Amino acid sequence: MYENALKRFGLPENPEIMGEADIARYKNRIPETYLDFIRHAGLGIWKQGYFQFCNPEKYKSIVALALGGDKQLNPVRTHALGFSAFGKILAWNEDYKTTEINILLHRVTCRGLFKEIPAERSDINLGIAVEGIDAESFDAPDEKGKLMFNRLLKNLGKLQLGQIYSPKLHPSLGGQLTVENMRPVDALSAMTIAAQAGPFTLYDTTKPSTPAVRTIGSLEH
Structure with missing residues (x-):
């Protein structure tokens, strides 16, 4: 299932081991082809920090925190x-497959909430998502629309496993979405702050309109 991703990205660099007890916890909750991939390759970095497992x-x-109280995308x-x-x-x-939680911009996206996916495509669905982690949509534009x-990478160095680039002063407080305001930080800590600093909006990326649907943890109006 991961032949193509491995061809394009090589071995996940500096992998952390995911133990068997942890992998056992997700039997029938995460597709086995993905879990076996992790069992072999571990949890590492691709494209010099552009994506990490x-x-x-x-986490x-x-x-x-981000999905607290949502009926359709249940955090559990x-x-x-x-x-x-x-x-x-x-x-x-587990119900709607691949999900994206945009911590920086406070957005959530789910294709299976809005177009139905047959349950026998799960392994393939996760496999497609993993092949795609190099899309430009996973970069992040600054205020002038220019990718960061x-x-x-050049000015702050490569991320270590368990870090992300995060704004020092968050835009919602007056901070700038520019490279100068970005710093490498502990991901779990930073994400813990961000996921509590306001609500998340669920978007429908099935339509070309990409319309806002509702607030996570609340009902649609």
Whole structure:
């Protein structure tokens, strides 16, 4: 299932081991082809920090905070698998499959909430998501629309496993979305703050309109 991703990205660098007890915890909750991939490759870094895999057990509080009280994307059934260099989480929802939690911009996106996915496509669905972690959508534009990853790699250095690039002064307080205001930080700590600093908006990326649907943890109006 991961032949293509491995061809394009090589071995996950500096992997952390995911233990068998942890992998046992997710039997029938995360597709086995993905878990076996992790059993072999561990939890490491691709593209010099553009994406990294994480232990869902270690980041479940972030899912709990961001998705707290949602009826459709229930945190108890949503598992953080990895994240971009800016903290955008690739997660697996047991009912609606691949989920993205954009921590920086406070957005959530789910394709299976809005177009139905047959349950026998789960393994393939997660496999497609993992092949895609190099899309530009996982970069992050500054205020002038210009992508930030390459400049941040050069000027701040490579992320260590368990860090992300995060704004020092958050935009919602007057901070700038520019490379100068970005710093490498502990991901779990930073995400713990961000996921409690206001609500998240769920978006429908099935339509070309990409319309805002509702606030996470609340009902649609």
